[PDB]
Copies of this chain bind each other. A is one copy, B any other.
């Protein structure tokens, strides 16, 4: 993953979310768009992007009850190694990959 910071365009990526829990659900995997956000401590899936039957627990933010597998997809369709998280769920303008995820991908902010 390598994305140039641009004022006018948000650093958006496509992500594959996979519910890995035992609880039965309509769709095990979904595709979403999420912002690479260096200012967020943790990852948050918007209420709009979160599957209705995917259970949440009172962490305003709720937290995924189940462990989610997160697959970041590069602009050319190449895949980063997946991460296992328990994302937050909230009413935010869009899904956000926080520093828990940025760290897991081994990202750095640089001009070198």
Contact = CB atoms under 8 A, between A and B. Distances in A.
Interface in A66-98: 80, 96, 98
> Which of A35, A39, A103, A106 gathers most chain B CB within 10 Å?
A39
Contacts of A112: 1-2
A82 to B, nearest CB: 14
Contacts of A108: 2-5, 109-111
Query: Copy number of this protein in the oligomer?
Result: 2
Contacts of A2: 108-112
Nearest to A99: B7
Given A1-B110, A39-B37, A103 B6 contact: yes
10 contacts: A1-B110, A2-B109, A3-B109, A7-B41, A11-B109, A36-B109, A38-B39, A38-B109, A39-B39, A107-B109
For the complex of A and B, list the 4 residue pairs with the smallest distance between their C-beta atoms, beginning with the closest: A37-B39, A5-B102, A2-B110, A38-B38
